[PDB]
Design a protein around this ligand. Structure first.
Ligand SMILES: Nc1ccccc1Nc1nc2ccccc2[nH]1
Length: 283
């Protein structure tokens, strides 16, 4: 079925939970043996969210190459994303090592450091120009260059230096700051505006490594971001845009990381975002 009328049909019939449970039943199951080794316990935030072995990002290190991060490679859309958990106190150096090694231009952050009164990720970037951060375990230096605070999101320019080689690179930090502590946003308009700002920066384009996107676990809000982006790109590429099937795209993405889209409300919000976004792209 088309999307916008499939949407009203699920609303009128109140069957979002059943649609979402079907997706959960059909989703791929692949091994995640490296994630579950005892030496990696303090590298995972949640015991039930792990990268598959076949798609995990490897650190360029011979001691321990493990990080909780996955490569989502979308063949028809010609887009790739790295989805990862919010960094932990003992993995902030690994996080920036990955950014460096994978040649990423942008980092997309969809959570606040504190939500619901608890810490959802480490403070992994510097908050003042004159107070830079040094990660001694991976030999990197990180400096805040500029910060632009808007009503729904903040963009930061950061400098990452590899202290072994003295090479430097400019990284863009796109921080969506207004996702509610509970539930999903009422309108997708500010989320879509944010996605378009990430696109306009070059961070999603083939001349760079894959964008790094995270929330707390790296599957819920993060899944919504890449699902909406890929669906909208396919609608621009195909002769028949009404052939784009958001459930089929989601199941393809779940071949590369488990659990993408965590609730039926997040599924409905993803449909809403693609539907409204497709009208703005044209006219
Ligand atoms: N794909 C295509 C085929 C024929 C004519 C125009 C278009 N481009 C296009 N881009 C879209 C983005 C969202 C929704 C529909 C869209 N159609």
């Amino acid at each position: 079925m088309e999307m916008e009328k499939e949407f009203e049909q699920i609303d009128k019939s109140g069957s979002w939970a059943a649609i979402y449970q079907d997706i959960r039943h059909e989703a791929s199951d692949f091994p995640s043996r490296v994630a579950k080794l005892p030496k990696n316990k303090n590298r995972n935030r949640y015991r039930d969210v792990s990268p598959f072995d076949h798609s995990r990002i490897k650190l360029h290190q011979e001691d321990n190459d493990y990080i909780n991060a996955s490569l989502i490679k979308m063949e028809e859309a010609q887009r790739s994303y790295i989805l990862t958990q919010g960094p932990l106190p003992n993995t902030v150096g690994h996080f920036w090592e990955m950014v460096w090694e994978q040649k990423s231009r942008g980092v997309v952050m969809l959570n606040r450091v504190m939500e619901k009164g608890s810490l959802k990720c480490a403070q992994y970037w510097p908050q003042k120009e004159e107070k830079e951060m040094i990660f001694e375990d991976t030999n990197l230096k990180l400096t805040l260059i500029s910060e632009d605070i808007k009503s729904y999101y903040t963009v930061r320019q950061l400098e990452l230096e590899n202290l072994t080689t003295q090479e430097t690179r400019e990284i863009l930090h796109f921080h969506y700051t207004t996702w509610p502590d509970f539930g999903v946003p009422e309108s997708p308009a500010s989320f879509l505006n944010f996605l378009f700002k990430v696109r306009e920066s070059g961070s999603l384009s083939p001349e760079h490594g894959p964008v790094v996107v995270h929330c707390s676990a790296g599957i819920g809000r993060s899944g919504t971001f890449c699902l909406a982006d890929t669906c909208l790109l396919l609608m621009d590429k195909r002769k028949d845009p009404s052939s784009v099937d958001i459930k089929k795209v989601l199941l393809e993405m779940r071949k590369f990381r488990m659990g993408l889209i965590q609730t039926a409300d997040q599924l409905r919000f993803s449909y809403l975002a693609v539907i409204e976004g497709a009208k703005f792209i044209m006219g």
